[PDB]
């Protein structure tokens, strides 16, 4: 039942080292993964040369493992998988998603009891979206929002399947984004587990206050 | 340069934050810019108890069957306004710098445009009737539509009228321009410009 999480955290050799309260965003994100007792270990893949991570209180946690990752997210995740131990299922979570709720994580982890290809947390589109004309900030058309979802993280998959698929994706020079996109590239259709929309990613300076608001709840 | 705003409003907008209803917050944000001389509110009662009814810059018109009908009624009350601003009654958080940037379109555009925020998450399309991923939807060039939506008065009136007569499926004002073959500009605005419907608490934080 053991699960190992992998947090790709390249870039310091990203806003993961920004703080909310007394912890960095990366620490909030990792403690959110450790709330579920099935998660036995969190592997953080940092860039060669990153001396920032070693400065955190989290660097001395007994369930954290730090390895160097590579150029692209897929290389980082593959580096993290080598340290997953005996886990047969792996969660991959964004270092800058510190508002992950335990309820959502538990619902996603329930997929290993039933599915073979895994799935991701996701939030249905509730607003209206527009597609811009190529290379211009003018509207081309309205995008149908029926069945349209935001992919969130974690993304939870069988370890070997994830490994094999990310390797094929890289070896064939496929353009991928999240781990689900690699599975999709390999012909699979991961489950969409609806999660809270406040599990946001901190990518711009204003996202920090919003994340804080959500954390205080 | 004069602009007339239209707020199609025929309970979310009657929820309150501080001393005011969401509708009041939304109207006051529009009235904060000097070019927006008047705000026409389409109404179908709750509105009458508010102080908006007796404000010197606020006009009331009857709301219609759908948002589109309401907007056309608001255009009938727009006077000589050459450009019109249409904004949701349930969007209380609008910053003046984003409003100013949208209003600047009148100086360079013949079509108008809308406030919008880029999509940053990877997006997925589900398999029909299943909670499984069919494929990824490219997010480059993908934007969340916001309001206000700002357009030349005649183009908006003519297009909306034609779309409605032809039975087009209209969501926002931009979608009517789209139906007619026009391409409104996307002006990036802040993402705290939320539409109330939990939203209350977040809108208050932003305010």
UniProtKB/Swiss-Prot annotation, chain B:
Pfam families: IspD
Noted pH dependence of activity: Optimum pH is 8.3.
Entry-linked PROSITE patterns: ISPD
Disulfide bonds: none
Record site: Positions MEP for the nucleophilic attack: 139, 195
Enzyme class: transferase
CDD domains linked: CDP-ME_synthetase
Effect of residue 122 to I: Loss of activity
Keywords assigned by UniProt, alphabetized: Cobalt, Isoprene biosynthesis, Magnesium, Manganese, Nucleotidyltransferase, Transferase
A Gene Ontology biological process term: isopentenyl diphosphate biosynthetic process, methylerythritol 4-phosphate pathway
Similarity comment text for this entry: Belongs to the IspD/TarI cytidylyltransferase family. IspD subfamily.
Other remarks on this protein: There are no coordination bonds that occur between IspD and magnesium in any of the complexes examined to date.
Quaternary structure and partners: Homodimer.
The protein's name in its UniProt record: 2-C-methyl-D-erythritol 4-phosphate cytidylyltransferase
Lineage: Bacteria, Pseudomonadati, Pseudomonadota, Gammaproteobacteria, Enterobacterales
